[PDB]
Structure formats: structure tokens, C-alpha cells
Design an enzyme around this catalytic site. Structure first.
Site: not given
Ligand SMILES: [Mg+2]
Lengths: 170, 365
Positions: A82, A107, A141
Site C-alpha cells: 500500500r 486496499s 488488488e
């Protein structure tokens, strides 16, 4: 109207990208995960889970559908990343040995990040890959559900970026 | 750099290759903000909806019959490398050498008999021919016919099935078509990369469908991310080669989203390694690296296959992977004729490659 657009769009993408994973998900689940990847869905949902806005009945149902769907998917057991920028007082809480836990979804992506003054490496296995729900299956993702706890097990400043290493603590 | 190193060390090292990762879409970038209502991060990304440049399929700039020769080379070359690599399977490197198609190995084979690597690839090929797409259930059903009934075997029996592949078939039979498993890192073995070629042939006209089918075909038995991503990288290498690229172009760094150990293979870190730095273990990363190394360090198909097979240990998997890559690079017409002549079911395997080639769907638009 919106949830049906999400469901039908996500179903088309999944049937192209991994039709067998699609069968793991109900209409409500696949549309909700897809909706999390839209700007309108994410901006309504994650700020409420993080305690910035109220978690209303519609948003509660939204979250439940996302997490019910993620729960069906196979574990992504590995390392994801991330790229982000944290306020100074938050970064100061990311010391080795510290604990972190986001009230919202987190995420990450399998790909190496580009932007952000902070690069978070995340090791765990509660994250689920959801790229098959996008049109081009291109962003890798991997989505961690709310209230996943992580221990900060390493940290270094390399060039202009702070690198942190999170280990999921089940 | 030793790919066995911990990913913290590798990811810090890999920062010199940040340009190989595609930029976030504007939506994914928003999801990476500390506060999406007060964004902090560059907002210049493309719509999540939109086709990224790294999925623009390079056109086939060679004649169709030449591309067909490379597609045949990829699938037949897989089988040839399998049949030769099994000879030294499980032996320590350089105790013995192999210089020809001689059979033997742990399964005491006749020359030209191939093993589970080719069996699984033929199951995958047949499932594409029947379904017109990647159908994981049909693929698993074909693997079960191989496993339980010896269909698509070189000698009529299933004899070399790996434990992880066996677990997946046993679990599919017990739990049905929704089962997915083998996610743990100890299951990041070679079974999916060694059967990849049919996906790259069928999807030769679309990098996106190659990307989407390559991890999916792995997932029929192997859901370790390093297996899934290694198939995606190998699948792109084969796409570039089947469509006519030079070896230098195919082996140059490509923009694509890959976990760090496959990213470093993409970055070319194997190119200057010596043989004693290359591992031919059952680990997917070792095997992929070793196969890229073997093709990079030889100049013809014959030499690529023997350099891989003589690595010993899991010689079978590195040779089968080398056979796909070298077969796409040099083409079926440059595989030694005596090896084609001895290879069991060679005509059938060539015809399946040809069928996949002509059935390949047009790029989406
Ligand atoms: Mg074998």
C-alpha cells in the site's frame, strides 16, 4: 438501480476473468465488492467504517455483503503493498513492535507501489484478491477486511520513502 | 540477488525497478489514501475502467505459418523437455549427465515417454478445444480422467502426480466445483508453470486474456500467488515469442504487476548468474528463473533443453519449462528431428497445438 448495475457489471467481468470464482459469489456479494471499487461506493462506505461518518442501515448492509463475499474467496497468502501518505502523528505510531488496526477495509495490491511517502508491505492471509471483478484484471488488488490487526515488524527510511512491514496477527 | 532471500530484503532491492509497475488507476489510488475525502496522492491516474498500455497486445509481425511453427514448438517442446528431463529427476547435479532422449529416470521409461507435465498440459489443451475458453471445471475433469483412468498418459497410467495436484483433485472430487485451495507457500510448486503453453497459444491474440487465463489455470490446482503470477509472466513470455518477437525483446523488462520474486525475474536478474547460482528445485520461482537462464545462455533448442535437464534435482520441471520457451523462440521446425521421431504421440501433440492456434479468439475491442 445502482446495486443492479454493480452486480451485472461485476458478473460480466468475472465471467471473462475467472468464471469459476464468480460462482463463489451471490448477486449481492459480487455487486457489493464491485461497488467498493467505485468512487461512490468507497467514499460512502469506508469513511463510515473508520468512524468519520455514521454507519447507517444501508451502509451496514453494504459492509456485510462485501465481507460475506470476501469470506468465500481463496486466501491470498503472501506480501502486498500500500503506497500512501500518513499524517506525522500517525506515522509516529508505526514503530517496530507497535500494533495497527484499520476500522475500514484496507486496499493493497500485489504490485510494487509508486506514490506515497510511506510504502507498507503487508504479510497476511485474510486478504483476498479481487482483480477478477475489474474489467481488465490489471491492478492485483488484495483487500483486507475491517479490523484486521497487524504488528509493525520492520521499518526503514530508504531514499524519500518510509517502508513499513506489517504482519497480520490472527 | 538470491531470490530465496526474504521479501523485505528483495523489495528494498527491487526499488531500482519501480518503473516496471503500472501506475494506480485514479480509483485504486483513492482507496490508498489515508483519507479519501481529503486526498493527498497524485490524482492523475486513468479510470479503473480503462485499458492500460501494458495490455496492448503487440501485433504478430511474422507470417501466420511462422507463428504456427512457434505455437507448435511451445507445446511439443514442453513434451520434449519433459521426456528428456525425467532421465535425471531426483539426482544430484552433475552425478550423471544426459545428452539425448533415452528414457529411464525414476519411472523406468522408454525413450520419448513424457510424464505428468505433458499429461496436465494435454488436459488443459483438450479443455480449451472443447470449451472455447478456460473452463476450470472441465480442466479438472480431464485431470481426473488422467489421474483415475490414465487418459492423456504416455504409457496408459498416471504415474508421476505431484502431492499438491493430487490434493486438489481429491478435494475437487470431495467438495465439488467450488473448491479452491492449496494457498499456502509450501504449495508454490511447479505443476502450473509446467503446463502453461496451451493457455498462451489459445490466447495468443490477447495479453489481457493471457493474463486472466494464466493465473486461473494455475488455480485449478495451485492457488499460491507465486505459482499464479509465475504462470502470468511465463504466459507473456510465450505470447511475445509466439507472435514473433526476438529473444532480446521477449527477455527485456516488461511493465506488469508482479510479486517481487517474479518482478526480479522480469527485471532480468538471472541473465548474469552462473550455473552454480541456479536452482532446479521444486519451487516455482527457482524453476522459472532456471528456465529463463537456460534459454538466455544457449543458442538453439537442443542446447537449451540439455542445459536445463542436466541441472539435476527437479530436472523434469526446468526442462519442460525451458521446452515451452525455447520451443516458442526457435519453433517446431528447429527441434531435432530424431527427438520428434522418438517423442511419444508427437503427431497428436502437434495437432492439438495447431488446433489451439487456429481457434485462438480475436483480441477484444
Ligand atoms: Mg514430471
Amino acid at each position: 438501480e445502482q446495486a443492479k448495475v454493480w452486480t451485472q457489471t461485476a458478473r460480466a467481468n468475472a465471467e471473462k476473468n475467472n468464471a469459476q470464482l464468480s460462482t463463489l459469489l451471490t448477486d449481492d456479494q459480487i455487486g457489493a465488492i464491485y461497488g467498493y471499487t467505485t468512487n461512490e461506493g468507497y467514499t460512502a462506505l469506508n469513511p463510515a467504517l473508520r468512524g468519520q461518518t455514521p454507519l447507517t442501515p444501508e451502509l451496514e448492509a453494504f459492509t456485510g455483503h462485501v465481507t460475506d463475499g470476501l469470506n468465500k474467496l481463496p486466501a491470498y497468502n503472501g506480501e502486498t503493498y500500500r503506497g500512501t501518505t500518513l499524517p506525522a502523528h500517525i506515522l509516529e505510531q508505526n514503530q517496530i513492535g507497535g500494533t495497527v488496526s484499520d476500522g475500514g477495509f484496507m486496499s493493497t495490491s500485489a504490485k510494487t507501489p509508486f506514490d506515497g511517502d510511506v510504502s507498507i508491505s503487508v504479510r497476511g492471509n485474510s486478504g483476498k484478491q479481487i482483480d477478477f471483478l475489474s474489467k481488465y484484471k490489471n491492478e492485483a488488488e488484495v483487500l483486507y477486511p475491517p479490523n484486521t490487526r497487524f504488528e509493525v515488524i520492520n521499518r526503514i527510511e530508504q531514499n524519500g520513502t518510509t517502508h513499513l512491514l506489517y504482519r497480520e496477527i490472527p | 540477488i538470491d531470490l530465496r532471500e526474504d521479501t523485505w530484503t528483495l523489495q528494498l532491492y527491487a526499488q531500482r525497478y519501480k518503473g516496471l509497475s503500472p501506475k494506480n488507476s485514479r480509483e485504486l489510488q483513492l482507496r490508498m489514501e489515508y483519507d479519501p475525502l481529503k486526498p493527498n496522492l497524485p490524482t492523475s491516474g486513468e479510470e479503473q475502467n480503462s485499458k492500460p498500455e501494458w495490455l496492448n497486445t503487440p501485433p504478430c509481425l511474422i507470417p501466420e505459418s511462422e507463428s504456427l511453427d512457434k505455437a507448435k514448438g511451445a507445446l511439443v517442446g514442453l513434451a520434449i523437455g519433459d521426456a528428456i528431463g525425467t532421465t535425471l529427476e531426483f539426482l544430484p547435479r552433475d552425478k550423471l549427465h544426459v545428452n539425448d532422449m533415452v528414457g529411464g529416470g525414476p519411472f523406468r521409461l522408454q525413450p520419448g515417454e513424457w510424464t505428468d507435465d505433458t499429461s496436465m498440459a494435454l488436459c488443459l489443451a483438450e479443455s480449451y478445444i472443447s470449451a472455447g475458453r478456460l473452463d476450470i471445471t472441465l480442466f479438472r475433469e480431464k485431470l481426473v480422467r488422467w489421474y483415475r483412468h490414465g487418459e492423456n498418459s504416455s504409457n496408459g497410467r498416471c504415474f508421476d502426480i505431484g502431492n499438491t495436484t493430487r490434493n486438489a483433485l481429491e478435494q475437487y472430487l470431495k467438495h465439488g466445483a467450488s473448491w479452491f485451495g492449496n494457498t499456502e507457500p509450501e504449495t508454490a510448486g511447479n505443476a502450473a508453470i509446467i503446463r502453461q503453453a496451451p493457455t498462451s497459444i489459445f490466447r495468443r491474440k490477447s495479453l489481457q486474456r493471457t493474463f486472466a487465463d494464466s493465473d486461473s489455470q494455475s488455480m485449478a490446482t495451485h492457488c499460491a500467488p507465486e505459482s499464479m503470477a509465475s504462470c502470468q509472466f511465463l504466459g507473456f513470455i510465450l505470447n511475445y515469442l509466439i507472435n514473433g518477437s526476438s529473444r532480446e525483446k521477449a527477455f527485456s523488462p516488461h511493465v506488469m504487476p508482479l510479486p517481487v520474486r517474479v518482478l526480479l525475474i522480469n527485471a532480468g536478474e538471472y541473465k548474469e548468474k552462473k550455473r552454480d547460482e541456479i536452482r532446479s528445485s521444486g519451487y516455482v520461482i527457482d524453476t522459472l528463473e532456471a528456465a529463463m537462464w537456460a534459454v538466455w545462455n544457449t543458442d538453439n533448442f537442443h542446447d537449451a533443453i540439455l542445459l536445463a535437464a542436466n541441472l539435476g534435482d527437479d530436472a523434469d520441471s526446468v526442462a519442460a519449462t525451458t521446452g515451452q520457451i525455447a520451443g516458442a523462440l526457435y519453433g517446431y521446425s528447429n527441434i531435432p528431428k530424431p527427438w520428434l521421431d522418438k517423442l511419444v504421440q508427437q503427431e497428436r501433440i502437434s495437432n492439438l497445438a495447431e488446433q489451439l492456434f487456429y481457434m485462438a479468439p480475436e483480441e477484444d475491442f
